[PDB]
Amino acid sequence: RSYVNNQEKEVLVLWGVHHPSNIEEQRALYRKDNAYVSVVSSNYNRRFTPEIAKRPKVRDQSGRMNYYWTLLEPGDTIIFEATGNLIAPWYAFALSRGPGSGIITSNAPL
């Protein structure tokens, strides 16, 4: 799947790669023992391979989902190619970055 950034702004794309806990979970969900995800743009390209191991549970899940992101520049195209395990983007964000700020952690009302 390709997406051409026609927003005249940066687009923030996020996605995920799912790592099952055993090979049977892999086969049931994706029907391949060996999957891979590729995300590639004009200045981004990573390949993501699922890595299956016994892990301690977190929120009662032994599996894991690794989350990733990139800022697709105006005019550039991002391409997703997957054999399995891809947590695909559905909604993304068109933004223009400001001069540069930070996070405040508080309970004071607005």
Epitope: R27, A28, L29, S62, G63
Partner: antibody
């Protein structure tokens, strides 16, 4: 693959009860046993066609019934035992027939992966039992 | 409810003949339609799932076509092991309903 074996049927008086059991065994893709799938009961009266009765999803939710058996029949499943049930009540003569246990094609949950399907598909019956016969006659 | 009408009620054919079984639906059920063979005394075995997909291990001669309200199962080279009753069944909505069946009869 997954095999299915109905049991617990036979001859019962009118207005009585009877509990059919459907036992699963074996596994499909990804070591998926019967608790990964949604199952339905389907009956066949002697010499006639197939009538769907009730459906239950993998986790035991989204029960539904055919109007003809609503209130009398109750579906359920002990996934620990990989077994389905059909609790028939107030049995009428026309309830006589061969009661089948039929698995739906699509995978509905993979519990160890923490994956569920948001909907209940209820698509093709790719595995049936040999059937158990229920004869309602005084 | 939803009514499935199957034509004909039975067809007599010879080995090697190509036969077309009809299953028309009382409303647009997209491609949520499947076909089962049922030899007598035995349970139904699935042939075609979702209008046009051949189920694993079913002979390649079985084909299925259709969408909307007009569906057909096509047995390409009819074999004596095909004798039996063929039911179409839908799941576009509850209650799940079957056609009346079409009995295949062999001429020899």
């Amino acid at each position: 693959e997954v095999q299915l074996q109905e049991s617990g049927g036979g001859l019962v008086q009118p207005g009585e009860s009877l509990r059919l059991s459907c036992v699963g065994s074996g596994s499909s893709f990804g070591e998926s046993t019967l608790s990964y799938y949604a199952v339905s009961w389907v009956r066949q009266a002697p010499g006639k066609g197939l009538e769907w009765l009730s459906i239950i999803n993998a986790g035991g939710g989204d029960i539904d019934y055919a109007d003809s058996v609503e209130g009398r029949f109750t579906i359920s499943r002990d996934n620990s035992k990989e077994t389905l049930y059909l609790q028939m009540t107030n049995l009428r003569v026309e309830d006589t027939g061969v009661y089948y246990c039929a698995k739906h094609m699509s995978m509905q949950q993979v519990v160890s992966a923490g994956w569920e399907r948001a909907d209940l598909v209820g698509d093709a019956f790719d595995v049936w039992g040999q059937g158990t016969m229920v004869t309602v006659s005084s | 409810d939803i009514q499935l009408t199957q034509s004909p009620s039975s067809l007599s054919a010879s080995v090697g003949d190509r036969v077309t079984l009809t299953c028309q639906a009382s409303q647009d059920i997209r491609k949520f339609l499947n076909w089962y063979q049922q030899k007598p005394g035995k349970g139904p075995k699935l042939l075609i799932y979702d209008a046009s997909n051949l189920q694993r291990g079913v002979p390649s001669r079985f084909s299925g076509g259709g969408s909307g309200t007009d569906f057909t199962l096509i047995i390409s080279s009819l074999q004596p092991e095909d004798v039996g009753t063929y039911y179409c069944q839908q799941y576009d909505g509850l209650p799940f309903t079957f056609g009346g069946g079409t009995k295949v009869v062999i001429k020899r």
